[model samples]
Target: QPVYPMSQLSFDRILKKDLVQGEHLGRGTRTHIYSGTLMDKKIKVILKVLDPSHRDISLAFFEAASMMRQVSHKHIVYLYGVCFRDVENIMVEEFVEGGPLDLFMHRKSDVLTTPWKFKVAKQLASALSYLEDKDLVHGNVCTKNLLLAREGIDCGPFIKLSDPGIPITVLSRQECIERIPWIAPECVEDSKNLSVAADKWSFGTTLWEICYNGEIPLKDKTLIEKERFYESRCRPVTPSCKELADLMTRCMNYDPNQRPFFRAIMRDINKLEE
Candidate 1:
């Protein structure tokens, strides 16, 4: 396939027949998602069709399709299939009924009261370890990337990572500046050798979100502004769980070298469970 920008595609041409009104699910700068079932199908699925007219977005999605098909795991979102209806590229993937983590955390009666936080922490760490073992780095690690499984009579919430990475050059220069919100201090100062350490920074933020239940530590700020604020240390807020709290800070450390590997993180979660 020719390497092309993802924005060149079109969604209006795709004939996606949803079982019900396409329930708006997740949103990004380029594409939007809907939760619905295929016609005559009994199971649910996420319909991610590209807004092809943008032209550039088609490249982003092209990368997404390639990445999704490459990685497969229990904790990772499964790539079911792809649909090409004319110029539209519809990605049919595993249907997660539990809802997005941000929305799920927001709807809770108490933001701090999260029973599955630890369980999910462990699962995510293990998943990270698995990915790392494969020499892969999750460019984006956040609570949003980690999904909660749909609740059933016997099956409760399980953690699954989604949207790990897309080699898309879509974000603006300003957005790159805003990367500091999740970038380590070293990265903010010197971004030349960006590596898994940057991912550790994101992992810390995900932990922070779990601890605070989606309370973005520093909100309504630009990248440079957020960097200035959190460069010294993560602000004071008691961690909901001790192990999780410590892990968050460890991962947040300014020295990426000092940060615990995902394997170590898995061990910590296991220790807490025991």
Candidate 2:
């Protein structure tokens, strides 16, 4: 199989320090994210690598970079480049010092006022709206997948959506089931049926996480009972803001057809801006 190279830069310009080897920023079933540096620019970055020898992961590794090439938004993670060398495929991404949104929220909860939460929600919706306008579904929209980049020396931080369109490659049924909290009810039956509506459902869950200050969905419910529970009246707590609470409810509507598109979501969230 021929590998499609995605970046225009030469390999010599990118360098990884040996000291950071095995120092991973995050990990998944088939991929691992590590901290690296672009030597020429002396800037930190993230390297998401997959083993090409693993037939199960090769296609997704390629597809993720292809999809990322089309999306360039302030609220979306920046893909610096991609390289397929030897037996490994690497995706170079901009590193955000603030890390994932969930961690940032947890660490700064006391300082993150209600208005700041609204800002975060708006940025997320903006990123989703951009993807929807391009006729693409993010497939995954959760606090864990959202990265926070600090601005103005610690003020006016912005949230960037990461891992857009990445496939769920979990091996175990139980492991897959564990992600049910943010996944849409319809998708739980057939993940192949996931669409823009499903993304909205996940988006609602993300909004809950933001407003609730990083609480996981169905935190107390047993995995066995979550499916029926969510379908039969279970939902996140009302947000502190009435408008936000209503929007979250509508986004998580039982019927996919009833959920508002990202454009409408962006508009509603815009109104909440000070």
Candidate 3:
């Protein structure tokens, strides 16, 4: 298995050290992101700075770059460059004018009706199928990862995956427990050995987030609470379309072998569109 070689340039080498941080766009466990400009690019990009004190900082910081290098598809965020400045591992990915879906839904929840949901679902399934081809699993796929291009609720919006770096390799089994509500049941316990099937689980959860209007199907339950809820064989609610529902259920099956391949999922996406 060949790993993707990350670009040599560090954060300082890539972007100006004094580049003004426009606003705190988002925050992860060990990284803080901001919307900022670099050297008059005329565009705002997400600036990800790793926490200095993080023990496994290097591995975690480089995960995004590695994934970016290995997977290049329209649906996944493109990596512009990286910088290592003042002990901060900074990564610059596509500006993504729109922020995470969680924030978007919070701003306007009522806009996500069923018909619009189907449109988004088809796009998501297409993207996931592409990632699955590279044997990459988006360990963290949730409302926060999906973004809309503009502010308003429009008929057409480009939905892309963001910050899919966290992996079971960098984090412990206990730590890798997905915090997202719509994640598949088998993955929480069996995602250690990475596989295409693991990614299918993520694909299913992502579709759920889009269809159900960003609510984690599980509501306000704690992490452990949600895990128990899944233990009872309760999968997330999918759309009324039987093929779509069956596709998601197959992806989330308890047995990894039972999951359909990405190629099959792509075919299903095509059929649904027709």
Candidate 4:
């Protein structure tokens, strides 16, 4: 059941035409995304609906909504509202025009430079720091889950982290392996047990992707092979930049305790920006 207590009187605020679904954004394990407008087309929002058949999705739905509502950061997407209509769990979120960070990196790589990577990394680290301060773990941090906001400037993108508080187990086993190469080895062994350290590991992986022009981690390895590599304490090769490579190595350390917390990560990356 949805946690937010929206009384029956609240439905009147959302008229029948308040929501007009546009194009389909994409589909997740038990969620459907669509472009939508709210307040009679005055506000553009992204509608994320959970499949009713999957009861587990409801837990993620409420958790994500609650987490997002707690933090207001420039690098975190905003949540407009949550609604349960016809037994469907729905979230109305801010519409981000630049799309996913993964696609943005791929499209801009030809002209991308090292300084841009520094800026992007700094923004992400700052966002993670804010979450950490709130005693929250992003739970999922990957290229695809981050949104890019292009402001027509040369500095860097205004990135926003999305999909907070949702478990990666929502993904199929094969899908999980393919999508999350940055997952901690411990998480690989058990997806249910995610922690700040696991998120730090994923942060390192995302930085690796940005530094390498959006290369997918372990793209060439088979699922079984990747598992073996993790079991042997092996991780992705470090990037060419000495500072970034060292950071990546530490973040992906076999021992989660050795991984730097988001605060430390943010401080170091801020130095890199300087």
Number of clashes in every candidate structure?
A: 14, 0, 5, 0
Sorted on lDDT, best first, the list reads 4, 2, 3, 1
Q: Estimate the lDDT of model 3.
A: 0.66
Candidate 4 segments exceeding 4 Å error: 1-17, 85-87, 151-153, 169-179
**Top candidate (lDDT):** 4
Q: Which ten residues in a row have the lowest lDDT in candidate 3?
A: 3-12
Clashing pairs in 2: none
Q: Estimate each model's TM-score.
A: 0.76, 0.83, 0.83, 0.85
**Which order, best to worst by TM-score?**
4, 3, 2, 1
Scored against the true structure, residue 266 in model 3 reaches a CA lDDT of 72
Report, for every candidate in turn, its global Cα lDDT versus the true structure: 0.64, 0.71, 0.66, 0.74
Alpha-carbon deviation at 154 in model 1, angstroms: 10
lDDT of 2 by residue, 51-128 (tens): 444555555565666666557899888876666654766777788877888877787777777667777888888888
Backbone clash pairs in model 3 (N, Cα, C under 3 Å; residues 3+ apart or in different chains), count: 5
lDDT of 3 by residue, 36-116 (tens): 876654666788777774546566557656676556677677777777654677777778777787777665667655555
Over 4 Å off in model 2, which ranges?
Answer: 1-22, 39-41, 51-56, 85-87, 151-155, 169-176, 220-222, 231-233
**Model 4 residue 40 distance off true place after TM-score fit, in angstroms:** 5.0
- Best candidate (score: TM-score): 4
